Amino acid sequence: QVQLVQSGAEVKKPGASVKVSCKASGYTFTDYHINWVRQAPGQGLEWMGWIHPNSGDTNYAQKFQGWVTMTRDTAISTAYMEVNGLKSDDTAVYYCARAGLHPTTTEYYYYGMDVWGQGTTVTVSSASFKGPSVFPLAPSSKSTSGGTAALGCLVKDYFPEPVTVSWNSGALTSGVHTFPAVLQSSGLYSLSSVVTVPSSSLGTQTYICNVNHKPSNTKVDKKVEPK
């Protein structure tokens, strides 16, 4: 079938360049335009331009002309998108797409996109492999049911995923809520884990979050006191 096979995920430091590839299969490469579209996390589709593999002709979008370069290698049926001077706002999924929707009239002489690649993730960050800092989220009962309190642990600024959190070495599982990590402009991750416990137990029972970040070989057992 008609497929576009895109290269793998990339982590780039600011200022670097990145060149992602888009290899065609299941059809003749020089028969259709290749369009490029990028999508920042949680945003919409953003057309970057197209290249015709037969002639090499390009049409750069206004927002991207001058700092991206579309090329192609017909010998190996591959198109390339190079992005230069990478900034944090260049973090996105970069799609290629075949322009298989031929025009129906000479009035609207446009070849539209039919088959899309799976996308190439590019994350621009000053991030290196980094263990997290763990801070306590001291108990409060303002948003929990009557007679219960919520306390937690802030696991801040780590890379890469994942971070696992347990409570009291696994003895405490009921009422534990570990929220999925946020990915920040720095390219570092942060997550929080909170457990809802009886208010009376705050004087009696000790609460420890067991944070494990294997990629940096960091472990923290943070005791969370009522303060």
């Binding site: 197209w50 979008a61 929080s192």
Partner: protein
């Protein structure tokens, strides 16, 4: 040239969803429609205003005339929940233009209001010359939410990072939002607030230094 789409449309299963794509003289252009699900690449569901591509159910129908193109999805199923994009070529600029995208929500359970928990920066973090406010949001449906931060009754958008909603074990949604401050910023204002808007209602929590 700009294509205007409503940011969101919500329907119950079996109902008919209608997604509009507004543009001047868009009836003269040929509109294609893309469907994108999370963990999906854009897929063609309508081509050439109204044509149905291969494999797409006949429930997916498009129309185009005047200043508005419309994607119509009859007998909506839960699998139709996705972001939909209209696309057009603008000859005067030689640009391919996508609409802003419409998130189609298929309402599979009653609305549930969010629970908001807000933690102030810890004293230990302040001693490390940092300050992070943690806003935790849970138990809401549908899984669409917008967070806004304020300080002394004034909007704050620098340093805000919000996750997208994620399903919980009880099949409701959860999310979190972080506000990174300096120790002086945290200590100089009255208070900061996390404002969570969900389905036209807002829940706001506020914390203050010491």
């Amino acid at each position: 040239s700009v294509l205007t789409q409503p940011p969101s449309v919500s329907v119950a299963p079996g109902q008919t969803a209608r997604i509009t794509c507004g543009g001047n003289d868009i009836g003269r252009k040929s509109v294609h429609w893309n469907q994108q699900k999370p963990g999906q690449a854009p897929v063609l569901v309508v081509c050439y205003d109204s044509d149905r591509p291969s494999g797409i159910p006949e429930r997916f129908s498009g129309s185009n005339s005047g200043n508005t193109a419309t994607l119509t999805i009859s007998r909506v199923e839960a699998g139709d929940e996705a972001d939909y994009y209209c696309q057009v070529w603008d000859s005067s600029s030689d640009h391919v233009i996508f609409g802003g995208g419409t998130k189609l929500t298929v309402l599979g359970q009653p609305k549930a209001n969010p629970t908001v928990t807000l933690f102030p920066p810890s004293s230990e973090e302040l001693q490390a010359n940092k300050a992070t406010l943690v806003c935790l949001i849970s138990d809401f449906y549908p899984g669409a939410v917008t967070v806004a931060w304020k300080a002394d009754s004034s909007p704050v958008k620098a340093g805000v990072e919000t996750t997208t909603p994620s399903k919980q074990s009880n099949n409701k949604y959860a999310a979190s939002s972080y506000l990174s401050l300096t120790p002086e910023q945290w200590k100089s204002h009255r208070s900061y607030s996390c404002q969570v808007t969900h389905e036209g209602s807002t829940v706001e929590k506020t914390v203050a230094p010491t």
